[PDB]
């Protein structure tokens, strides 16, 4: 009897046993643990090399089990109908917290309870960075481990105190430690290896804002071009079939084709084929969401509309023409701002982004100061027509408007098509 060792069930009698579902599945204990919970009794594990084992009476269980883990760690467990029977209560943790003065005060008290020495400005800066990590204006990040790590770095850079300057220094150092790829990209842009048009007008070319994933984060601009030729109603997206892709119908290509075919109804079929290419790979294309940049570039190519290269265009688009929210909007806007500032801020550069992302706009201090000074502009759009109006600097409707120019380009392509059609007859 004296060799029986107490495990975790014995030590948690009349108390709480906190386990990890990831551990319950990693060591395969979940079957035996389920059996113990359902039976209400458990005996200590016995190695098979013992034909002398005790007939130990099963140990009663008067504990409460509190599994802890990620939702994906529990997807394996919630499939079992018995897991939903033993564990009736689900204590779900929100990935964010409301951004309120009460929550900022609670964060300050939590940081003080961790041993940090805070300042009101330092607490404010930490709270703002927590809001930015959630990428939401009215929601601060719930991940207290990450905020604690940032506070640790801020304390180290400020000696022992979390002042505003120390937290700003910690954030800047975190940015710098992962800025090698972006420093190389900016150096290439400045030298001329990667040429992005940040000034003037261009026909069929736009500055899309991509998030690079063949490399680390910090989304950056990319010159996306659209070329319009007489032909079928086929919309070619060169980057989405870099290999095959004729076997694959792409949701972005289908969305763009639907918009172009349905919005422009004066010939029975789109008399123009539009080829969309992302020059300077390192561009990770969506393939499932049609970009607003692609649509405005296609419209410019069709109508020979010179779009402003000052403004970068980001945000998904819908087949109706509705601009949808995109992730990492702050990263894209700040990457374009970095590129513009590296080449010199002309005072007319900007970013065209959806109004849906306005609740996710937590731009850094430099971008906001440029916006205040009028050196950087942020345009928020609902529809692709608004983005095209901003880019081409003209209203869609009215005489000599963008709509009439696009229709004239379409009818010119149709005339080229019929000129080739009579070539097939006579």
């Amino acid at each position: 009897v004296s060799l029986i060792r107490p495990g975790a069930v014995h030590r948690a009698q009349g108390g709480y046993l906190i386990l990890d579902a990831l551990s319950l599945k990693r060591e395969g204990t979940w079957e035996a643990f389920k059996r113990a919970l359902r039976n209400g009794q458990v005996e200590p594990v016995t190695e098979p090399q013992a034909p002398a084992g005790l007939e130990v009476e099963p140990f009663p269980i008067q504990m409460q089990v509190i599994l802890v883990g990620t939702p994906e760690a529990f997807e394996g467990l919630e499939e079992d109908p018995a897991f939903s029977e033993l564990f009736r209560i689900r204590a779900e943790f929100s990935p964010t917290l409301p951004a309120s003065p009460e929550n900022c005060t609670a964060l300050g008290g939590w940081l003080l309870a961790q041993g940090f020495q805070l300042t009101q400005g330092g607490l404010t800066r930490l709270y703002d960075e927590a809001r930015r990590m959630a990428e939401q204006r009215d929601r601060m990040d719930a991940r207290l481990v990450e905020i604690r790590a940032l506070a640790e770095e801020a304390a180290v850079l400020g000696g022992g105190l979390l002042t505003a300057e120390s937290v700003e220094q910690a954030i800047a150092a975190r940015e710098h430690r992962s800025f090698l790829s972006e420093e190389e990209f900016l150096r290439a842009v400045q030298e001329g290896v990667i040429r992005l048009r940040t000034t003037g007008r261009a026909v069929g070319e736009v500055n899309s804002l991509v998030v690079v994933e063949a490399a680390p984060y910090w989304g950056r601009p990319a010159r996306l071009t659209a070329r319009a030729a007489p032909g079928r109603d086929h919309l070619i997206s060169i980057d989405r079939e870099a290999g095959l892709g004729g076997q694959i119908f792409h949701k972005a290509v289908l969305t763009l084709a639907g918009y172009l075919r349905s919005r422009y109804i004066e010939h029975g079929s789109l008399p123009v084929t539009i080829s969309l290419a992302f020059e300077q790979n390192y561009v990770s294309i969506e393939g499932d969401s049609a970009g607003l940049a692609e649509l405005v570039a296609a419209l410019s190519a069709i109508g020979n509309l010179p779009l402003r290269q000052d403004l970068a265009v980001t945000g998904a688009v819908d087949q109706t023409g509705k601009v949808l929210a995109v992730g990492a909007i702050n990263a894209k806007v700040e990457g374009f701002f970095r590129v513009c500032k590296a080449l010199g801020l002309s005072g007319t550069q900007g970013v065209i982004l959806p109004e849906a992302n306005l609740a996710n706009l937590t731009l850094r201090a430099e971008v906001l100061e440029a916006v205040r000074a009028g050196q950087f502009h942020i345009y928020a759009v609902e529809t692709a027509e608004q983005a095209l109006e901003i880019l081409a600097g003209a209203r869609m409707e009215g005489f000599r408007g963008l709509q009439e120019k696009i229709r004239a380009g379409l009818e010119a392509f149709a005339r080229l098509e019929e000129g080739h059609d009579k070539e097939d007859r006579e």
Binding site: V1, H10, Q13, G14, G15, Y16, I18, L37, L54, P58, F59, Q64, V65, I66, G69, T70, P71, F74, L77, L86, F87, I89, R90, A91, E92, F93, S94, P95, L97, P98, N103, A106, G108, G109, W110, L112, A113, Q117, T119, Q120, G122, T124, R125, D128, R137, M140, A142, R143, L144, V145, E146, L161, T163, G350, L361, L368, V371, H377, Y379, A380
Partner: protein
């Protein structure tokens, strides 16, 4: 529409930075009222619960801090007593008697 600076300014205005903050510690699961209420129900009723959420939340730390404030009835002394050299039973005694 062209967004103005005030339509884009999100940072909380800093007002004072010459003094440290004196803030009482927050209750466990601050800003997590759903998780706190679910765990309170699981403690009141004695049900088994499971905590779900993204990593780096400090779920274990907050859970331990919340459970440390609970006051459960004094658990009895559970022990293993040999009823023979081969048969071992489970004995339950009043707390502090084992």
């Amino acid at each position: 529409m062209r967004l103005s600076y005030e339509a884009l300014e999100w940072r909380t205005p800093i007002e004072n930075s010459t003094e440290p903050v004196s803030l009482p510690p927050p209750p466990p699961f601050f800003g997590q009222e759903r998780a706190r209420e679910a765990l309170e129900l699981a403690i009141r009723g004695g049900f088994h619960a499971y905590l779900v959420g993204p990593p780096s939340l400090g779920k274990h730390e907050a859970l331990l801090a919340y459970l440390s404030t609970q006051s459960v009835e004094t658990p009895p002394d559970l022990l293993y007593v040999p009823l023979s050299e081969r048969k071992v039973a489970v004995l339950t005694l009043p707390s502090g008697q084992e």
